[PDB]
Amino acid sequence: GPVPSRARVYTDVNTHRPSEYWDYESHVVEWGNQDDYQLVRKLGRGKYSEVFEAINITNNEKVVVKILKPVAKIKREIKILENLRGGPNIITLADIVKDPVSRTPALVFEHVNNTDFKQLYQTLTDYDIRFYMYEILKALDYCHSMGIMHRDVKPHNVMIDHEHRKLRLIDWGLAEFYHPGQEYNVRVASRYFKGPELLVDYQMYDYSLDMWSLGCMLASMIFRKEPFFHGHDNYDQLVRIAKVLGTEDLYDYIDKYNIELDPRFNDILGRHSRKRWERFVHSENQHLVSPEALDFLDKLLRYDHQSRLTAREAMEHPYFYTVVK
Numbered sequence: 001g002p003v004p005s006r007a008r009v010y011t012d013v014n015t016h017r018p019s020e021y022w023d024y025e026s027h028v029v030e031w032g033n034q035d036d037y038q039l040v041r042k043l044g045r046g047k048y049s050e051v052f053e054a055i056n057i058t059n060n061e062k063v064v065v066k067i068l069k070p071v072a073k074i075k076r077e078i079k080i081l082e083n084l085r086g087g088p089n090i091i092t093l094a095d096i097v098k099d100p101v102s103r104t105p106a107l108v109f110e111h112v113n114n115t116d117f118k119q120l121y122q123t124l125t126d127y128d129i130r131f132y133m134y135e136i137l138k139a140l141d142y143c144h145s146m147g148i149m150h151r152d153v154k155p156h157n158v159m160i161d162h163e164h165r166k167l168r169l170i171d172w173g174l175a176e177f178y179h180p181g182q183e184y185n186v187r188v189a190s191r192y193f194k195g196p197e198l199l200v201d202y203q204m205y206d207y208s209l210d211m212w213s214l215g216c217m218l219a220s221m222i223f224r225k226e227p228f229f230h231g232h233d234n235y236d237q238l239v240r241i242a243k244v245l246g247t248e249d250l251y252d253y254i255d256k257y258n259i260e261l262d263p264r265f266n267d268i269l270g271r272h273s274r275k276r277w278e279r280f281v282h283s284e285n286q287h288l289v290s291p292e293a294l295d296f297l298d299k300l301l302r303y304d305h306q307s308r309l310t311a312r313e314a315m316e317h318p319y320f321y322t323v324v325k
């Protein structure tokens, strides 16, 4: 059977906090008043929610309302949002109401004047990538230190008001409490951001999953290639990774955890050498790449989840020396 694994940091944060902290099922929601809010416009729709720009008419402030589709695990997202509230760069849950139409809970958040992703990605300077990556790390070290893994780190879940240089990590719907030895569902994160642990069906994963997703974001930005690992499906996703990191280190990884690859891989994986990060550098991205960016990326994009930098280690990296703190 597979070899067990544990996080190398914040391993026992949940056993030492009171049960009411992590036992989200026993949490009692204290409902706000839907009366307080007036919907202005529909911002988006996902498979789990509809998001609206709204006005809180009791204090005349712009808010964002996320009306959850009935699909249960709502208590988990509420509990995590309340636990993390006030944390650095963590979106603030302002209220919880019952939508009289859907009959489901609606989460009310603070509003972030989010600059369009493809508009921002195209204008980021080297300094701005370092600056915003440091702001994301503050959010991840905080939630990790609080015994929570995000499990959906990706550019669409990072709200940025570029004008005010304000960042918020949002969409805590897939976030979970980390309990050592617990097996988790591998059907988390967006395809391009899924860690090798998920792709090889290794269930005893931890906060380090977030650090692989962060590395995918960093690679896409510094190299100007969105997404960096462009798999057609979950199987080709691992082949795309193996074409860069190599098959020898992939085999060492699955061997360490006594994991067997799905036989489907026999006809598609092949043999690949590890590629030097310098190969992805070209005249259109050279101004975003440095030896420090490459060294930092190399320490995030590792097969072995136990070998990745943690968020706190990542904030110590020379890549961030230039960032004003």
Ligand SMILES: Nc1ncnc2c1ncn2[C@@H]1O[C@H](COP(=O)(O)OP(=O)(O)OP(=O)(O)O)[C@@H](O)[C@H]1O
Pocket (backbone or CB within 6 Å): 043, 044, 045, 046, 047, 048, 049, 050, 051, 064, 066, 091, 109, 110, 111, 112, 113, 114, 156, 157, 159, 170, 171, 172, 173
């Ligand atoms: N606080 C916020 N301020 C501004 N926009 C927000 C805020 N929170 C969420 N959004 C917007 O809501 C949309 C998606 O929200 P969210 O990620 O929380 O839910 P979701 O169910 O995962 O939806 P999706 O599958 O579309 O990503 C995005 O368009 C994002 O810009």
Ligand SMILES: NCc1ccc(OC(F)(F)F)c(Cl)c1
Pocket (backbone or CB within 6 Å): 115, 116, 117, 120, 121, 124, 128, 129, 132, 133, 136, 154, 155, 156, 157, 158, 159, 160, 217, 221
């Ligand atoms: N979703 C907006 C958005 C815009 C730029 C981004 O990259 C950056 F963090 F480096 F700035 C991200 Cl992660 C997200």
